[PDB]
Design a protein around this ligand. Structure first.
Ligand SMILES: Cc1ccc(C(=O)N[C@@H](CCC2CCCCC2)C(N)=O)cc1NC(=O)c1cnn(-c2ccccc2C)c1
Length: 341
């Protein structure tokens, strides 16, 4: 019918959950939002429970709440975070004011893993393979992550990887961002995420941030030093006059030979980096193409790299009232079907 809930105070936060979830312990020191590790008495498994912060306080909060629930309810893939449960203590739409989301509990984020040292080439093959397998899935539904960086990627002891998003909650996004979506200078596609994967892979191999810019101007200067200033062919496709003026006003840099930058790395790794870190977003490798690159010979299976069901994002166009976004969210909580045990 409906379970029995119990109340708690944790880090100045109130928490009201079903008895099924036990021994709630705050994790991530703010960086994941309001999240507790919990023990799930139904499965005998550890889980993560997130309490959304002020979910219906404004129109923009209410839309963000709907968007996060809709994305989580869609994701059914080994390398993307998925929804085990969603609950509110509210018995009706009228008193609906709190949303709790339940996922798998992961062992570590990749930020607090590179921080020690660099990884073996074999560890890098396996981790980048799993990122690209999750991205083929997300991109097949016309979903773009847009903020891939080591702090949004999580792994277990056995090195199984999942893509998450910790949104706004306290490693600069700037350092991993595609030049075209940073300065909005060209048509942008799913391959903004492939630029980010290139930056992350470089960092796992060298143990150093590839492009540690201090701001957007410093960031572009560090990038152009490796990949070279745009040619006349890429200049032809820049719609922004101010962008085009800025670029053409710098003194010309050549493309460096990546074999001279990533010295001693697997030459198959250097070749894949050349294909990911191209300025022209029409010429960057896709996730599906990257999975068939020789670098992943050990892992690639074309019969086990699935696509996603279609995702209706027509809501993204709509301008509705708080109470409308709230009712739509309540509907999705009510209609939720747990994954098969
Ligand atoms: C409970 C929960 C709820 C929401 C999210 C989450 O990723 N939400 C996304 C969903 C959509 C996004 C679209 C692009 C593809 C990726 C997904 C968002 N911002 O909308 C994560 C967890 N879980 C965690 O925060 C979590 C799970 N173990 N840990 C953890 C716990 C201890 C140590 C290390 C880690 C990583 C943290």
């Amino acid at each position: 019918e409906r379970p029995t809930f119990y109340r708690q105070e944790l880090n100045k936060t109130i928490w009201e959950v079903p008895e099924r979830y036990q021994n709630l312990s705050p994790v991530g020191s703010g960086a994941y939002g309001s999240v507790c590790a919990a023990f799930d008495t139904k499965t005998g498994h550890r889980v993560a429970v997130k309490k959304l912060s002020r979910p219906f306080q404004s129109i923009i909060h209410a839309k963000r709440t709907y968007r996060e629930l809709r994305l989580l309810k869609h994701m059914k893939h080994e390398n993307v975070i998925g929804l085990l449960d969603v609950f509110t203590p509210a018995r009706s739409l009228e008193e609906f004011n709190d949303v709790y989301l339940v996922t798998h509990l992961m062992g570590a984020d990749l930020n607090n893993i590179v921080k020690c040292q660099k990884l073996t080439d074999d560890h890098v093959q396996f981790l980048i393979y799993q990122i690209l397998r999750g991205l083929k899935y997300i991109h097949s539904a016309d979903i773009i992550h847009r903020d891939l960086k080591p702090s949004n990627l999580a792994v277990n002891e056995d090195c199984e990887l999942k893509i998450l998003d910790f949104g706004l909650a306290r490693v600069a996004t700037r350092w991993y961002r595609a030049p075209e979506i940073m300065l909005n200078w060209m048509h942008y596609n799913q391959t903004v995420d492939i630029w980010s994967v290139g930056c992350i892979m470089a960092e796992l191999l060298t143990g150093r941030t590839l492009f540690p810019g201090t701001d957007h101007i410093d960031q572009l200067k560090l990038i152009l030093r490796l990949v070279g200033t745009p040619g006349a062919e890429l200049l032809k496709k820049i719609s922004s006059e101010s962008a085009r003026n800025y670029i053409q006003s710098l003194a010309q840099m050549p493309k460096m030979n990546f074999a001279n930058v990533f010295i001693g790395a697997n030459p198959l790794a250097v070749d894949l980096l050349e294909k990911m870190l191209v300025l022209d977003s029409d010429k960057r490798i896709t996730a599906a193409q990257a999975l068939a690159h020789a670098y992943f010979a050990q892992y690639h299976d074309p019969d086990d790299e699935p696509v996603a069901d279609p995702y209706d994002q027509s809501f993204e166009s709509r301008d509705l009232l708080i109470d409308e976004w709230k009712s739509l969210t309540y509907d999705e909580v009510i209609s939720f079907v747990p994954p098969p045990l």
